[PDB]
Design a protein around this ligand. Structure first.
Ligand SMILES: OC[C@H]1O[C@@H](O)[C@H](O)[C@@H](O)[C@H]1O
Ligand SMILES: OC[C@H]1O[C@@H](O)[C@H](O)[C@@H](O)[C@H]1O
Ligand SMILES: [Ca+2]
Length: 345
């Protein structure tokens, strides 16, 4: 594994699977990610898939979730499709893909999540719907008192005042968004020990992370969710569980520019989370080695985990590279990440 270099599939073509993630099913790894074009910032083709038995050699499986050709469709060509993730639902035997969708021609304003489903890992995936998350529902961890507070929008027009920040912390944008649903941009999925799945996403104008329970078929949200680090600008979440404890790596909010990573931890998915120092160590750790978090893959056969990141190139997004590095653990069990030029499983 040679982070930062040009990686090619088994036909000699450049691997094009950004903002991605991996699952293992019936003996093979499947890597889903954004097909990015050589120019621009929209999705021309959709979500790409690659497969491998060894994590070194990747066969192109083609587009797993294609853009629609129907005019006015949610995923019409020219929408923005980002950070796709796939989880296998054991109950229904289906593959469920969630992704960040922004409607064609509307920049990043819509802030939706979208869901699609397939009987096979590589697709084709069938689009079901898009929208903002859990319309009408409050977070479990907003008290009755906090839920009663009202916030006149004309009094809070200026961002980053003391009163505005407090208001954001106490849930002013949760209430603003309560009718039509919570905003969802950068996102991930996690399937827990008990078969419950969670949708983790940057909400409230990117200011606040939310963690939402999915229904038993993984196709919708139950209404149960929490909100964490309000005003923190945690983005690009990646998450794993080890020995009962949850660990989440996130970026800051600086568009395509790299920034300092954060480590977050909890002893229950919907309990209280705490922030720890940057998990990246050594030279360039302050810039996440020039990358941005996308996924943490468990390798449960080994009791190991590895960290996947993107090295973004906004001038030609298809030239964006991949950083994959092992997760290491200190003598207290706290995960950390060191750069290695080349490494092996
Ligand atoms: O993100 C997709 C959304 O779809 C909506 O129809 C639903 O009301 C939301 O709770 C959410 O599941
Ligand atoms: O909007 C430009 C980019 O901003 C990043 O912060 C985000 O993680 C990406 O998925 C993309 O949306
Ligand atoms: Ca958001």
């Amino acid at each position: 594994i040679a982070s930062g270099k040009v990686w090619r599939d088994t036909d000699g073509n450049v691997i094009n699977a950004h903002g991605g993630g991996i699952l293992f099913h019936e003996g093979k790894y499947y890597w889903f990610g954004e097909h990015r074009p050589a120019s621009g910032f929209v999705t021309e083709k959709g979500i790409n898939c690659y497969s491998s038995t060894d994590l070194y050699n990747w066969k192109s499986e083609g587009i797993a979730l294609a853009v629609s050709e129907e005019e006015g469709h949610d995923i019409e060509k020219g929408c923005i499709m980002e950070r796709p993730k796939v989880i296998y639902n054991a109950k229904t035997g289906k593959f469920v893909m969630w992704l960040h969708l922004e409607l064609k021609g509307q920049g990043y304003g819509p802030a939706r999540a979208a869901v699609a489903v397939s009987d096979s890992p590589a697709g084709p995936y069938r689009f079901i719907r898009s929208g903002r998350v859990n319309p009408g529902a409050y977070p479990l961890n907003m008290t009755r008192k906090e839920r009663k507070m009202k916030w006149n929008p004309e009094e809070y027009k200026e961002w980053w005042t003391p009163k505005w920040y407090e208001a954001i912390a106490k849930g002013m944008f949760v209430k603003r968004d309560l009718k039509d649903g919570q905003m969802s941009r950068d996102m991930t999925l996690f399937v827990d020990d008990d078969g419950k799945a969670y949708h983790i996403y940057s909400s409230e104008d990117n200011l606040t992370l939310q963690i939402a329970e999915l229904a038993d078929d993984y196709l919708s949200h139950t209404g149960k969710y929490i909100r964490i680090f309000p005003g923190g600008h945690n983005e690009a979440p990646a998450i794993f569980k080890k020995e009962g404890t949850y660990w989440m790596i996130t970026s800051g909010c600086t568009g395509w520019d790299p920034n300092k990573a954060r480590l977050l931890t909890a002893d229950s998915m919907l309990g209280e989370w705490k922030q720890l120092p940057n998990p990246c160590v050594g030279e360039d750790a302050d810039k996440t080695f020039g990358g941005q978090s996308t996924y943490i893959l468990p390798l449960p056969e080994k009791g190991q985990f590895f960290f996947m990141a993107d090295m973004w190139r906004p001038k030609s997004l298809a030239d964006s590279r991949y950083i994959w590095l092992p997760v290491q653990f200190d003598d207290k069990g706290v995960p950390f990440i060191k750069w290695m030029d080349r490494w092996n499983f």
